[PDB]
Amino acid sequence: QMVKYFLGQSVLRSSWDQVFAAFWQRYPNPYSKHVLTEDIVHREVTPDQKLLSRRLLTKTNRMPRWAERLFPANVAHSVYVLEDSIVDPQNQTMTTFTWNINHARLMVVEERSVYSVNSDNSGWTEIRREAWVSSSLFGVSRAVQEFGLARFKSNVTKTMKGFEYILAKLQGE
Amino acid sequence: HHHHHHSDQMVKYFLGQSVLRSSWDQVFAAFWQRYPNPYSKHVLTEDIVHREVTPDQKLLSRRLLTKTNRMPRWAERLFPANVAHSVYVLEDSIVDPQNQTMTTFTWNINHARLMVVEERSVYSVNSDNSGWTEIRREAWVSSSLFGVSRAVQEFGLARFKSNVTKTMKGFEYILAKLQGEA
Amino acid sequence: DKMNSVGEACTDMKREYDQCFNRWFAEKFLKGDSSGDPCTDLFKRYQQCVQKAIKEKEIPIEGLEFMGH
Amino acid sequence: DKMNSVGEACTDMKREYDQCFNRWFAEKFLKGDSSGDPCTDLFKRYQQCVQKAIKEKEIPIEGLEFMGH
Numbered sequence: 001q002m003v004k005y006f007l008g009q010s011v012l013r014s015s016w017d018q019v020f021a022a023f024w025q026r027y028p029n030p031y032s033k034h035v036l037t038e039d040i041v042h043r044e045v046t047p048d049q050k051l052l053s054r055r056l057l058t059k060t061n062r063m064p065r066w067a068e069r070l071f072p073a074n075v076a077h078s079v080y081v082l083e084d085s086i087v088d089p090q091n092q093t094m095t096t097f098t099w100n101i102n103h104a105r106l107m108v109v110e111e112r113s114v115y116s117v118n119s120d121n122s123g124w125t126e127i128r129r130e131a132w133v134s135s136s137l138f139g140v141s142r143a144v145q146e147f148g149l150a151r152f153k154s155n156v157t158k159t160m161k162g163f164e165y166i167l168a169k170l171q172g173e
Numbered sequence: 174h175h176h177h178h179h180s181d182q183m184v185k186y187f188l189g190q191s192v193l194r195s196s197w198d199q200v201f202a203a204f205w206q207r208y209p210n211p212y213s214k215h216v217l218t219e220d221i222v223h224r225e226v227t228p229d230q231k232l233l234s235r236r237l238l239t240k241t242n243r244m245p246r247w248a249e250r251l252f253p254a255n256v257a258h259s260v261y262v263l264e265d266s267i268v269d270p271q272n273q274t275m276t277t278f279t280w281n282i283n284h285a286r287l288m289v290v291e292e293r294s295v296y297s298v299n300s301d302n303s304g305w306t307e308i309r310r311e312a313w314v315s316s317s318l319f320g321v322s323r324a325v326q327e328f329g330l331a332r333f334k335s336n337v338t339k340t341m342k343g344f345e346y347i348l349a350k351l352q353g354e355a
Numbered sequence: 356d357k358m359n360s361v362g363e364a365c366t367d368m369k370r371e372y373d374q375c376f377n378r379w380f381a382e383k384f385l386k387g388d389s390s391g392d393p394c395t396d397l398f399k400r401y402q403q404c405v406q407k408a409i410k411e412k413e414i415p416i417e418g419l420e421f422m423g424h
Numbered sequence: 425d426k427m428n429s430v431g432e433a434c435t436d437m438k439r440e441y442d443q444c445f446n447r448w449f450a451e452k453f454l455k456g457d458s459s460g461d462p463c464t465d466l467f468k469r470y471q472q473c474v475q476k477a478i479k480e481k482e483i484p485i486e487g488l489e490f491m492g493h
């Protein structure tokens with residue numbers, strides 16, 4: 001586990017058609033102040049009557065203070081997020097895939113969600129939500145360790161050659 | 174001679190064994206005289222900053238070295254603040270002539286958020302020949318970047334969960350705004 | 356009350372395409388009505404603006420497979 | 425052919441103390457001889473210079489247990 005995996009489940013006490021409509025109208029809302037920008041950057045209806053959309057959000061970068069001090073070059077930049085979706089009215093399902101496309105060296109959060117008719121109540125909507133949190137910094141830590149070990153081993157050779165040099169010089173004054 | 178290394182827990186552990194074809198007393202004397210030498214151009218500065226003899230006739234010393242900071246370029250870009258600084262290294266030693274052993278413990282005291290290399294070495298009379306000296310060398314290579322990687326990941330997960338709550342409350346706000354018009 | 360586009364010059368084109376798209380979505384699409392897209396012309400007008408704004412801001416959205424890989 | 429001290433003004437003092445110590449180490453200490461130390465006043469003068477230089481350069485050597493224990 002360098003990648004953290006999340007699995008979640010939610011119920012919206014509204015019907016699937018209301019939820020699917022609300023999906024496109026939910027911004028702005030009182031809980032979305034961190035969402036600054038919203039655009040559709042691609043949209044088509046497929047032959048099997050599926051709606052394919054790609055939505056671009058810009059969001060505020062809000063980092064704990066310690067990460068601001070460690071990652072100064074990231075503090076100034078907003079987060080850009082793509083949300084791909086497939087809306088399928090024939091099966092009353094919607095599938096979404098959301099991930100940040102910048103700050104990607106620092107961390108990537110990917111979310112895959114499925115919206116469907118609540119199995120207990122046909123008037124409600126369940127959401128099954130999967131997420132993966134990854135950071136290329138684990139690979140950087142390993143590269144730094146491997147460099148440290150390589151330099152240490154090289155310096156051991158220099159240490160011993162240096163010892164042999166001075167002992168030969170001292171043996172006979 | 175031989176050596177090996179492997180992980181400990183995101184710590185890399187090294188164990189090495191070598192021999193000097195010189196007697197223990199010559200090696201212990203040479204320890205103090207080995208700088209400078211043709212293989213030590215990266216060692217810029219050398220000082221004793223503590224030294225005493227114990228009641229049991231052991232020599233305790235602390236030697237401070239300044240060493241050149243030579244990082245690969247990818248690491249310079251990642252760690253701009255580390256490029257201008259040499260490496261400061263402390264070497265603590267106990268010389269025990271009654272038992273013909275010397276023990277050293279060497280580590281960097283700066284650049285320590287980026288990595289720490291700790292080396293523990295024991296010099297003793299070689300078991301096979303009285304005119305040789307053997308060295309048992311252990312080392313630990315660690316980096317606080319692993320703990321940083323985990324902390325970044327934990328803040329990403331926490332912020333994700335918080336955004337899920339906001340997403341759901343937002344849905345509930347707009348559903349109620351939509352179900353109040355038709 | 357409404358969101359801004361990532362291109363300021365595109366916001367009012369966005370507000371008008373979204374508003375049209377929502378009417379078509381609820382009334383035709385979700386109901387299975389297969390008559391073609393109503394808001395087509397509003398969309399490529401809107402697109403023309405935002406796509407330029409995206410390149411201008413160097414938002415790196417190109418070459419990204421749909422729904423991830 | 426001799427090492428510099430981290431303190432620029434200290435290097436000759438370091439060099440004079442080191443070779444006094446080398447002689448005492450090899451000829452007395454390593455042979456179990458307990459004639460104290462003949463280099464103490466070289467050492468005290470040398471430490472005054474170098475401990476000063478370590479503070480001015482803010483080298484962080486304080487508070488560090490011996491042999492990392």
Ligand SMILES: CCCCCCCCCCCCCC(=O)O
Binds near residue numbers: 063079081333
């Ligand atoms: C310091 C910022 C780096 C990472 C930005 C994370 C943004 C999350 C992208 C995936 C969002 C899933 C949807 C959601 O949050 O509700």
Ligand SMILES: CCCCCCCCCCCCCC(=O)O
Binds near residue numbers: 242244260280281
């Ligand atoms: C980028 C600087 C990172 C840390 C520097 C490593 C210094 C090594 C300290 C331990 C030295 C043991 C002796 C040796 O390396 O030969």
Ligand SMILES: [Cl-]
Binds near residue numbers: 033
């Ligand atoms: Cl605020």
Ligand SMILES: [Cl-]
Binds near residue numbers: 059060079336
């Ligand atoms: Cl976010």
Ligand SMILES: [Cl-]
Binds near residue numbers: 070071072073251
């Ligand atoms: Cl940075």
Ligand SMILES: [Cl-]
Binds near residue numbers: 090
């Ligand atoms: Cl239907």
Ligand SMILES: [Cl-]
Binds near residue numbers: 074077102
């Ligand atoms: Cl970025």
Ligand SMILES: [Cl-]
Binds near residue numbers: 139140143247
């Ligand atoms: Cl890397």
Ligand SMILES: [Cl-]
Binds near residue numbers: 150151
């Ligand atoms: Cl190297």
Ligand SMILES: [Cl-]
Binds near residue numbers: 236
């Ligand atoms: Cl020395």
Ligand SMILES: [Cl-]
Binds near residue numbers: 252
């Ligand atoms: Cl960093």
Ligand SMILES: [Cl-]
Binds near residue numbers: 251252253254255
């Ligand atoms: Cl930095």
Ligand SMILES: [Cl-]
Binds near residue numbers: 255258283284285
């Ligand atoms: Cl440092």
Ligand SMILES: [Cl-]
Binds near residue numbers: 066320321324
């Ligand atoms: Cl931390």
Ligand SMILES: [Cl-]
């Ligand atoms: Cl026209």
Ligand code: NA
Binds near residue numbers: 033
């Ligand atoms: Na506010």
